[PDB]
């Protein structure tokens, strides 16, 4: 991750967007902080506070990290936009192109204690998007 962000701030930048534009546009906001195009990314059409409250759901195994059990699944399906990189040979970020796949799915996040740079308003925060279902 970019060192200027905590895990939660970088989670919010990648994964929280209520009304994202098309993927090729929406992804520039993320890739501008990277040296290379992110291969896949899901935008959850929700708010950070909403995801923080999902961190309070019962602790479950993370489907994409099966040695971890600090994951939390949403009780409802939420609208999302998934973006897949069409040109993974891209050598820089200037011309990343993405395919769009809108959907409505449950999401699963890993949550952990906040970083000291994070707002004291949320002592526990999402730090990774594990999967959607």
Query: Which residues, 6 or more positions from 123, have their beta carbon under 8 angstroms from its beta carbon?
Result: 113, 114
Query: Is position 70 annotated in a ligand binding site?
Result: no
Give the domains, in start order, of the chain with CATH numbers.
Answer: 1-133 (3.10.130.10)
Q: What distances in angstroms separate CA 53 from CA 19, 41, 57, 75, 88, one per listed residue?
A: 20, 22, 8, 11, 35
Query: Is position 39 annotated in a ligand binding site?
Result: yes
Query: Is position 58 annotated in a ligand binding site?
Result: no
Structure method = X-ray
Beta strands in the chain (DSSP E): 40-44, 71-73, 78-85, 98-105, 107-113, 124-132
Query: Which residues, 6 or more positions from 52, have their beta carbon under 8 angstroms from its beta carbon?
Result: 111, 122, 124, 125, 126
* Enzyme catalytic residues: 15, 128
Q: Resolution in A for the shown PDB structure?
A: 1.7
């Amino acid at each position: 991750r970019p060192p200027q962000f905590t895990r939660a701030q970088w989670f919010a930048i990648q994964h929280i967007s209520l009304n994202p534009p098309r993927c090729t546009i929406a992804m520039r906001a993320i890739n501008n902080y990277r040296w290379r195009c992110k291969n896949q990314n899901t935008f959850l059409r929700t708010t950070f506070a909403n995801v923080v409250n999902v961190c309070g759901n019962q602790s479950i195994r993370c489907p994409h990290n099966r040695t971890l059990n600090n994951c939390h699944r949403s009780r409802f399906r939420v609208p999302l936009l998934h973006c897949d990189l069409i040109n993974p040979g891209a050598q820089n970020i200037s011309n990343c192109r993405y395919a769009d796949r809108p959907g409505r799915r449950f999401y699963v996040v890993a949550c952990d204690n906040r970083d000291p740079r994070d707002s004291p308003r949320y002592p526990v925060v999402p730090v990774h998007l594990d999967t959607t279902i």
